[PDB]
């Protein structure tokens, strides 16, 4: 929702940095000589940076050794195909994706090879455990930049993620429009929290991810990306328990579009049922168990299987957990619909209150000057004769006598 | 254009529900015993919902 407030970064900028280093003369030979004995090695390049190195396929020691003397049984044909197919598929994946592929496919790096790279990675055992149990997610957060094909090796860099922040508390915020419930059509006003998305504690502050679609979830673990995040103060959490706190100005979005919708949460469902829309919450055995009244309400997944709003049927998540309903007056009722700023996107609580004070200011001040600025006498008619003051008008003085 | 006015839903919620039902004990054996003869069958799970 607030994804526009994020910055713009270059993702593979690090890998490309290593990539251009391999273009230098002799740099590839250091790797070829390091991997001449074993299949995995550590190489410190010219710029001093140390990188892991891996040889996954050796067609040289096959074509030049097992295949060349015949060219100088049928099984040898199939054996070649099995050895060559990977080189073909790696080629195909590159030739489409313009040299940069993500996620890293199994052809580019098998699970055994990826677990080997994680095992030799220079980080803690906790990170090794995390990356080893969630290799599918690590693949989705990794890149494969094709570098060089120099005499006589093929090379591509696999840009792997480093999880510097682990085991800190996270929480996901879901929001939905909060409108009034009048009978007239255009008479309602609406308000919605825009800060929805993922939040995680990080270095005494909070990392906020407005595009929760980019954060991947496995069990209760959340793999987010700091590149598309925001570093907010710790006080941001107050917006959930006290939206009108002065120490943090919570962001909202105003409108007049009272449409009915539903937001499926992790353990329940929010239903904003406005207008003549019929919204229900149903159970797979009992049937309809709740008919929502006009307004924004909530229903937990404890015993509910479906939630229907209008012509839309949502299936709620059947995850195990305790859901608590916190009572409270909808804050939209705290506003007067006659001075409510209805065109606000990048807004906040204080911006709306200040536009209301400003809109209210001009009326009380215009009345404070104009009412009454007619308590004074105007200018007499500007003709030749003189005019005296009588009642509310300028009487011709010549009438005396 | 008005895509922001839309709600937020979980797409795979139903399939994942059936998935969590399939983790239960004996649930897989009912399927393996049902398909021991033919390749296609209709099976009613523990919660009564019938699935292909």
């Amino acid at each position: 929702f607030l994804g526009f407030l994020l910055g713009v970064g270059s993702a593979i900028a690090s890998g490309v940095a290593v990539c251009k280093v391999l273009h230098l003369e002799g740099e590839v030979n250091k790797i070829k000589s390091a991997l001449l004995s074993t299949n995995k090695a550590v190489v410190s390049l010219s710029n001093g940076v140390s990188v892991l190195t891996f040889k996954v396929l050796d067609l040289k020691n096959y074509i030049d050794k097992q295949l060349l003397p015949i060219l100088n049984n049928i099984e040898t044909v199939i054996e070649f195909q099995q050895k060559n197919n990977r080189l073909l598929e790696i080629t195909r994946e590159f030739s489409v994706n313009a040299g940069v592929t993500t996620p890293v496919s199994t052809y580019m790096l098998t699970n055994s090879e990826l677990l080997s790279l994680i095992n030799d990675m220079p980080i803690t055992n906790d990170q090794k455990k995390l990356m080893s149990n969630n290799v599918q997610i690590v693949r989705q957060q990794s890149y494969s930049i094709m570098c060089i094909i120099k005499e006589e090796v093929l090379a591509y860099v696999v840009q792997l993620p480093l999880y510097g922040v682990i085991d800190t508390p996270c929480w996901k915020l879901h929001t939905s429009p909060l409108c009034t419930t009048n009978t007239k059509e255009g008479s309602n006003i609406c308000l919605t929290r825009t800060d929805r998305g993922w939040y995680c504690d990080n270095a005494g502050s909070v990392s906020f991810f407005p595009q929760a679609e980019t954060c991947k979830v496995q069990s209760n673990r959340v793999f987010c990306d700091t590149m598309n995040s925001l570093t907010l103060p710790s006080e941001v959490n107050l917006c959930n328990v006290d939206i009108f706190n002065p120490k943090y100005d919570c962001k909202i979005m105003t409108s007049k579009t009272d449409v009915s919708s539903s937001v499926i949460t992790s353990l329940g469902a929010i239903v904003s049922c406005y207008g003549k829309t019929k919204c229900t919450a149903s159970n797979k055995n009992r049937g309809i168990i709740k008919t929502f009244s006009n307004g924004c309400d909530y229903v937990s997944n404890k015993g509910v299987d479906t939630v229907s709003v209008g012509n839309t049927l949502y299936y709620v998540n059947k995850q195990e957990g305790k859901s608590l309903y916190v009572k409270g007056e909808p804050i939209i009722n705290f506003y007067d619909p006659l001075v409510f700023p209805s065109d606000e996107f990048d807004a906040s609580i204080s911006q709306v209150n200040e536009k209301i004070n400003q809109s209210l200011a001009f009326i009380r001040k215009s009345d404070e000057l104009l009412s009454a600025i007619g308590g004074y006498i105007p200018e007499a008619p500007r003709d030749g004769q003189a005019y005296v003051r009588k009642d509310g008008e300028w009487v011709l003085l010549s009438t005396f006598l | 254009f008005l895509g922001f006015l839309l709600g937020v839903g979980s797409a795979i919620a139903s399939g994942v529900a059936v998935c969590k039902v399939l983790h239960l004990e004996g649930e897989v054996n009912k399927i393996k015993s049902a398909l021991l003869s033919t390749n296609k069958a209709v099976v009613s799970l523990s919660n009564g919902v019938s699935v292909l």
Partner: antibody, heavy 127, light 108 residues
Framework: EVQLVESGGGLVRPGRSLRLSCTVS????????MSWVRQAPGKGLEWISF??????????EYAASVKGRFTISRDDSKNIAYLQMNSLKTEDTAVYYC??????????????????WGQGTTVTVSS | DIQMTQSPSSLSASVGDRVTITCRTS??????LAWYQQKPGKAPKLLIF???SLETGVPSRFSGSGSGTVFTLTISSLQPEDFAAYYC?????????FGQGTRLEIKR
């Protein structure tokens, strides 16, 4: 955190009256519905009464065995639920438990079980 | 009222055995069955709600099944803690009548 403490039991003559009081502590009392279930010595569980939340009216639902004799009520101002027992018989001698009805969702007038249970209070009716 | 009938009333079983209690109703309760565990003198504990849904904090060995008229509670691997009384309750309409009860004893 969540607790139901029923009180007011003890000895009472057959044909007299006794008022049980269930104090709720740990959650919102106004949003939740309360129920009374008793267990006679040696016998199984018997459902007695049920009072809905304020949101869904104030409907008191009793069982056939005590309908017309017992009366359930609630005081949301002090988070308490009463069970007024009138015209007591000797068969009413039992352990009285205070329970919370679990709505089929976060808030719904359909209940799937009795969530929280009090520890119970013993009521002996004998002359 | 809706009639509840539990079978059997008494059950003898050892530790690690697989037991199944049955609750028959008179009408179609639309899957509004509840299973409770009551140890002698102590308050009952809600084990299973809806038809098969498990209450939070209940071990995985407790399974609920059945539909319409017949409902089954199953304990896969018995433990010394599971020897108690078990009651089924209907939640279709009032009254929320209870079941007969099932005493679960240690076989000897």
């Amino acid at each position: 955190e969540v607790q139901l403490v029923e009180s007011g039991g003890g000895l009472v003559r057959p044909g007299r009256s006794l008022r049980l009081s269930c104090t709720v502590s740990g959650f919102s009392f106004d949003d939740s519905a309360m129920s009374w279930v008793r267990q006679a010595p040696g016998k199984g569980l018997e459902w007695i009464s049920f009072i809905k939340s304020k949101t869904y009216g104030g409907t008191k639902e009793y069982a056939a065995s005590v309908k017309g004799r017992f009366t359930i009520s609630r005081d949301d101002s002090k988070n308490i639920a009463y069970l007024q027992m009138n015209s007591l018989k000797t068969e009413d001698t039992a352990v009285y438990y205070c329970t919370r009805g679990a709505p089929y969702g976060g808030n719904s007038d359909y209940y799937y079980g009795l969530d929280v249970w009090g520890q119970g209070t013993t009521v002996t009716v004998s002359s | 009222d809706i009639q509840m009938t539990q079978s059997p009333s008494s059950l003898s079983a050892s530790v690690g055995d697989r037991v199944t209690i049955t609750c028959r109703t008179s009408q179609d309760v639309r899957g509004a069955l509840a299973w409770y565990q009551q140890k002698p003198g102590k308050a009952p504990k809600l084990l299973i709600f809806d038809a098969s849904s498990l209450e939070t904090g209940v071990p995985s060995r407790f399974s609920g099944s059945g539909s319409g008229t017949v409902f089954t509670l199953t304990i896969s691997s018995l433990q010394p803690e599971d020897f108690a009384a078990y009651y089924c309750q209907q939640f279709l309409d009032f009254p929320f009548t209870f079941g007969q009860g099932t005493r679960l004893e240690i076989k000897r």
